[PDB]
Amino acid sequence: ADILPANYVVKDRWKVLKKIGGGGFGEIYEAMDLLTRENVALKVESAQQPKQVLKMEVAVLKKLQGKDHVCRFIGCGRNEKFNYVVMQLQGRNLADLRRSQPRGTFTLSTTLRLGKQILESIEAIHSVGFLHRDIKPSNFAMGRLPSTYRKCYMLDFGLARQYTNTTGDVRPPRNVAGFRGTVRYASVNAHKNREMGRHDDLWSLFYMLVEFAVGQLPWRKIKDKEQVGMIKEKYEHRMLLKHMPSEFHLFLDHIASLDYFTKPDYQLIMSVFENSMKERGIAENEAFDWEK
Numbered sequence: 023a024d025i026l027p028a029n030y031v032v033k034d035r036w037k038v039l040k041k042i043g044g045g046g047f048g049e050i051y052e053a054m055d056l057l058t059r060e061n062v063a064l065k066v067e068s069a070q071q072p073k074q075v076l077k078m079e080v081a082v083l084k085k086l087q088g089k090d091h092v093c094r095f096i097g098c099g100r101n102e103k104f105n106y107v108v109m110q111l112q113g114r115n116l117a118d119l120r121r122s123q124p125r126g127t128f129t130l131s132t133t134l135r136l137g138k139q140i141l142e143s144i145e146a147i148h149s150v151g152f153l154h155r156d157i158k159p160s161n162f163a164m165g166r167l168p169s170t171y172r173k174c175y176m177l178d179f180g181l182a183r184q185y186t187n188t189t190g191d192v193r194p195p196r197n198v199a200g201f202r203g204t205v206r207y208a209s210v211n212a213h214k215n216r217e218m219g220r221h222d223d224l225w226s227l228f229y230m231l232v233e234f235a236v237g238q239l240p241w242r243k244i245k246d247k248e249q250v251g252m253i254k255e256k257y258e259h260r261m262l263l264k265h266m267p268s269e270f271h272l273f274l275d276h277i278a279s280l281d282y283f284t285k286p287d288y289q290l291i292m293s294v295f296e297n298s299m300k301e302r303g304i305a306e307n308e309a310f311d312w313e314k
């Protein structure tokens with residue numbers, strides 16, 4: 023039973039058309055904005071949920087206004103039954119787009135071009151003092167308009183954590199931190215209950231790109247967090263690069279050397295994607311796999 027039924031109207035403005043997503047922490051709907059006449063995304067969480075994450079989501083989404091790869095903030099509110107955020111509506115997510123591919127793989131062209139946009143999104147959130155902590159294909163969606171269909175948008179800021187403080191400094195990490203994010207894309211550090219850093223969001227991007235190009239990860243079928251962590255610890259990460267562009271060794275080595283305290287070298291990773299494209303004769307203007 024959905025939190026909101028079809029045609030329910032939020033704050034005399036947003037009319038629920040259909041449920042477009044959900045699972046963790048609540049549900050997301052496509053709604054008609056009765057004031058502006060545009061289709062929007064309405065994200066809701068029940069007010070009786072023990073962990074309320076929309077307060078974080080709203081704060082991060084507002085802090086990100088003006089950045090590329092981010093939904094326009096439309097509104098938000100709270101009541102006794104539910105909390106909500108209203109934002110720009112996008113198209114299909116990357117997990118859905120990958121699963122729809124014949125072999126569940128994207129071409130290197132699509133993989134590398136998505137990698138550039140996701141890396142830019144990751145650098146954008148870190149630049150406002152926040153870690154995403156839940157980097158995964160379903161938290162990235164393509165635009166749905168002729169002016170936005172080749173733009174990839176970063177979604178879901180509910181599990182975000184501010185690593186900076188009021189004075190523009192980096193706060194000390196806690197001695198221990200509860201597991202946050204997806205099991206499939208979490209770094210080994212996240213599995214060990216270490217405080218997550220900027221490098222951990224880059225580990226999730228590394229695993230996503232391997233999954234995009236290869237179609238699977240070695241721990242794909244395992245659901246248990248601990249069993250997955252053991253596989254990732256034991257697994258020779260160089261074996262993940264068998265079918266990857268050779269400059270991915272540079273990406274892997276850089277992230278493997280980082281800790282919570284060290285600012286990543288985002289340009290080093292960008293250079294890996296750019297050289298991988300040029301060495302293959304891949305143009306930036308190429309159509310994405312799903313366009314064909």
Ligand SMILES: Nc1ncnc2c1ncn2[C@@H]1O[C@H](COP(=O)(O)OP(=O)(O)O)[C@@H](O)[C@H]1O
Pocket residue numbers: 042043044045046047048049050063065093109110111112113114115160161162163177178180
């Ligand atoms: N602005 C949006 N436009 C289009 N689809 C969206 C939007 N926000 C979320 N979704 C869809 O619903 C799912 C949304 O959940 P999301 O905010 O990403 O995470 P969650 O349900 O894990 O808190 C996504 O994978 C995507 O398909």
